[PDB]
Amino acid sequence: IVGGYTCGANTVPYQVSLNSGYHFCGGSLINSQWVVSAAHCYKSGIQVRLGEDNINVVEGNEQFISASKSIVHPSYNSNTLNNDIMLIKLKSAASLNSRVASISLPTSCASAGTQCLISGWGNTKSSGTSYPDVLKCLKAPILSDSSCKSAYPGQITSNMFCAGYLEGGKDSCQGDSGGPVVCSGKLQGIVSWGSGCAQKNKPGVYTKVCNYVSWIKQTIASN
Numbered sequence: 001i002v003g004g005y006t007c008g009a010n011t012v013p014y015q016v017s018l019n020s021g022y023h024f025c026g027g028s029l030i031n032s033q034w035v036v037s038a039a040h041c042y043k044s045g046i047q048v049r050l051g052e053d054n055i056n057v058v059e060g061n062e063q064f065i066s067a068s069k070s071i072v073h074p075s076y077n078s079n080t081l082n083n084d085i086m087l088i089k090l091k092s093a094a095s096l097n098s099r100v101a102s103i104s105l106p107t108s109c110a111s112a113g114t115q116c117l118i119s120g121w122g123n124t125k126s127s128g129t130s131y132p133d134v135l136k137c138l139k140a141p142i143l144s145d146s147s148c149k150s151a152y153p154g155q156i157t158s159n160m161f162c163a164g165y166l167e168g169g170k171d172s173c174q175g176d177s178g179g180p181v182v183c184s185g186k187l188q189g190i191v192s193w194g195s196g197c198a199q200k201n202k203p204g205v206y207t208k209v210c211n212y213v214s215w216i217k218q219t220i221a222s223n
């Protein structure tokens with residue numbers, strides 16, 4: 001997260017870190033056994049880390065649970081990033097509490113102008129490279145479909161939306177991948193892609209979660 005703020009320990013209780021020896025992506029806890037992330041975060045050997053603030057220090061609220069299976073969306077295209085969504089099942093159910101909690105799925109899509117919270121452990125620099133240890137947060141509005149398409153000609157599908165600031169300065173960045181965009185207590189987005197970070201007229205692009213609620217629910221119901 002570039003141009004954000006320190007969230008505060010365990011203030012984003014649905015935020016997870018995906019770890020394969022090191023943090024490599026974010027994710028969102030949607031029930032005791034399931035995490036939603038980006039398809040471009042897919043790899044084998046994933047451990048889900050819940051209750052994290054400082055990802056380099058055991059602070060006492062963590063739960064470390066290995067993934068039993070990952071399900072990348074059937075229509076994910078890694079070239080265009082269309083359908084950039086994946087589900088991860090935990091080997092055992094997380095113990096839910098005030099600091100480790102699921103986030104609600106949307107019942108309808110959020111509109112341009114809706115204010116949201118984007119969070120992650122990604123790069124905090126738009127030019128250089130600096131990775132934070134503690135979770136970073138950014139309050140950002142959803143942008144109109146037209147402004148999103150104008151920012152990225154030929155690249156915005158019906159399964160994507162832009163959020164952030166056309167002036168730049170405040171954005172998601174590498175390492176925030178797969179993490180949450182939450183608006184009015186609902187998971188509306190997944191950190192998906194962009195051109196650099198916090199650059200003028202290049203806001204973050206997010207997977208449009210409301211399009212996938214049926215797939216998420218039916219997948220969970222049979223797996």
Ligand SMILES: N=C(N)Nc1ccc(C(=O)O)cc1
Pocket residue numbers: 171172173174175176177178191192193194195196197198199202203204205
């Ligand atoms: N938000 C931006 N303009 N850049 C950007 C966004 C997401 C990712 C990701 O890897 O998920 C990387 C870079």
Ligand SMILES: [Ca+2]
Pocket residue numbers: 052053054055056057058059062
């Ligand atoms: Ca920790």
